[PDB]
Design a protein around this ligand. Structure first.
Ligand SMILES: [Cl-]
Length: 148
């Protein structure tokens, strides 16, 4: 199973791994002043990092299936997409491009929200060429997609 990380950046089980250098998640980075849910129409911006915004503090963008988006989050999170909980699927009609996420396989993925509310990833380059949807979330925890 892909590990979770606490807001001090320590692995809560298993062994820790680094993010792909080209991921939109840049570590180390603070987070977890507050858990702040946001709507997809109110996804945060880069310049919210220091000030926060109207809705509260901002460490970046987090997402889990539902879809549920957060601009900050205090509990355990994934730093890489837990691919054991994804399944192969055709490209969807995408509604939003949300960042570049490291897969639990070490590869870079483009991450999208689909019209059907699914979170989908597509491999960024190389032999890979894979499209997968996030279908299970047994630890009910988001991916940290981007850090501000
Ligand atoms: Cl997993």
């Amino acid at each position: 199973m892909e590990p979770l990380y606490d807001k001090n950046g320590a692995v809560l089980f298993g062994e820790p791994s680094d993010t792909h250098p080209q991921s939109t998640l840049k570590l180390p980075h603070p987070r977890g002043e507050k858990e702040v849910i946001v709507g997809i129409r109110d996804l945060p911006r880069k310049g919210d990092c220091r000030t926060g915004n109207r809705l509260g503090p901002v460490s970046g963008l987090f997402v889990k299936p539902g879809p549920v988006f957060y601009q900050d989050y205090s509990g355990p999170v994934y730093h890489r997409a837990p691919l054991e909980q994804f399944k192969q699927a055709p490209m969807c009609e995408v509604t939003k491009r949300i960042g570049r996420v490291t897969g639990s396989d070490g590869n870079l993925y483009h991450m999208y929200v689909c019209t059907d509310g699914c979170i989908l990833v597509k491999t960024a380059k190389r032999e890979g060429q894979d499209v997968l949807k996030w279908v299970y979330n047994v630890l009910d925890s988001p991916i940290w997609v981007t850090s501000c």
